[PDB]
Amino acid sequence: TQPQMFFGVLDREELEYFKQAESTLQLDAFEAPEEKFQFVTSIIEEAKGKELKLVTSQITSKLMERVILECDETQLKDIFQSFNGVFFGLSCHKYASHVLETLFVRSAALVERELLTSGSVTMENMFLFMLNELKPHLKTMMNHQYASHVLRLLILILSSKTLPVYQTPESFKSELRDIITTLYKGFTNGAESRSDISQSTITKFREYSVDKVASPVIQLIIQVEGIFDRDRSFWRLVFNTADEKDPKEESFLEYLLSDPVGSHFLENVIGSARLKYVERLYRLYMKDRIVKLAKRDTTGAFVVRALLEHLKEKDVKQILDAVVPELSMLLNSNMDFGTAIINTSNKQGGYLRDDVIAQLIQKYYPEKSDAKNILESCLLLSASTLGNTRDDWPTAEERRRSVFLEQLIDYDDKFLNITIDSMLALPEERLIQMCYHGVFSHVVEHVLQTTRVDIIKRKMLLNILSKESVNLACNVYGSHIMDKLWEFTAKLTLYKERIARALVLETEKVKNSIYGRQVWKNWKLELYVRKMWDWKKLIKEQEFEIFP
RNA sequence: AAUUGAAAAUGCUAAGGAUGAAAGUCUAUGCGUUUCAAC
């Protein structure tokens, strides 16, 4: 019982033609867009009849995706129609399922357009035809390594959510209900009420909740079923409602809290289920062991984080009372968790702020150390991507450390001051390298908070940054730093004049760069050149605008 | 404006299927190796 996924092969002539056509289309060396459209139409004309062969070959599936993205709307409807009949088979194909994903996103966009203009309802009907094609295969798709992706995308589209957001006719809401009900029928044998559900079916569905392929689909369904099913049938198929613990449910919960797929399943459903059901799970199976779970950084930590992010204030504060003392340990092996804990503390009116500040100070910027620097204890700057000769991009550990340092800077002024001092202690060429970095740039950008930085630090920072005005403005990352400097130079009009003159000196290079044009706009240098006095008046207005 | 693949080359096998009176031959949708691609 396997659907047909082979539809013939192309001979070497066609393969060579389509390789050359993909190269030509990828270079995008066409002058007028009409030439590009005519070339796309030529590729489509040569691709007539061969659609099934093209989308099922690893050599030409990418070209088909490009063509689906670049063609017009009539050609899009043609390509959509040519797949008719074999949608399930294509969605079970390793390379064709991706083509189906591209096609379905573009076609959802087109259905949104035709819904908010002249109700053509042609694309809508093609979508309904493919959905009815797939409806007798939904349970199978849910467990398939490639078709489950297509099913998840279809559920996203139908429930109007962010695709990797478009409006949907009411037919799409009905089709969503159809898909969800069909799957529920397929997992409840023939039970006509929830009292008829057997314990064996519940056991097998929990098995699916832990399956690496089905679990994302179960999460999405649990999330979106509240749109039409007030009773949350799929939720009730996983967890109980009794006010007391259940041995089967307790073993299932203790398995979720120790398995990666299960922990992420629980993390995801926690944020999309009813608050009362989540509170029940917390009270029955988690309230007593919060610390032990919070230390499980690959499993239960995600659940504790979701609890901190989605519970009521009393329970959030109890969890913070449990967790904050362990923050120094947690940050050694799970910095995203610590950043979340600090963020939650801050959003809860700075709850337990003093203990957090003490732990962070003693761990990252102690007073007794001689050469204290928070860029070296947090970002590990000396052993980082910064200033390397080879073309290595910034890593993920650097990105999470930068997020953490920025969380500290937004948590208390002590960390903003510490970061500014640490920056001024580097050799200024290293700070300028930070300004040019992909991830560390944000860190620099984050200390440019005008009302929170005393005037002397602003003067030192501004003198360091002004010498590289033109080079920063024309840079992808430094241009945002210059934009922040526009406001950062408040009571320091002489640095405004210095940066303005510096940019005007190389006006030509500044305007040739795109970011240079953006900085030219944001600093309003046209008013500086044309009428200096209106520029000074704008500056004098901004001064008392920032400092009243 | 920040491990998998019906991919190539080259080999192994012939259950099923084709042919044959039989022997045999052909055929991979089963496989080895070296590349290629992707995540």
Structural description of this entry:
With 548 residues, the chain is an all-alpha fold. Among the domains are: 1-151, Leucine-rich Repeat Variant (Alpha Horseshoe), CATH 1.25.10.10; 456-548, no CATH class. The protein is 68% helix and 0% strand. It has 36 helices and no strands. The longest helix is centred in the N-terminal third of the chain and has 20 residues, at 96-115. It is globular. The chain binds one RNA strand of 39 nucleotides through helix 34. Its main location: nucleus. It holds the Pfam family PUF_NOP9. It is found in: Nucleus, Nucleolus. RNA-binding nucleolar protein required for pre-rRNA processing. Component of the 90S pre-ribosome involved in production of 18S rRNA and assembly of small ribosomal subunit. Component of the pre-40S ribosome required for release from the nucleolus. Pumilio repeats lie at residues 46-81, 82-117, 133-164, 200-240, 248-282, 283-321, 425-462, 463-501.
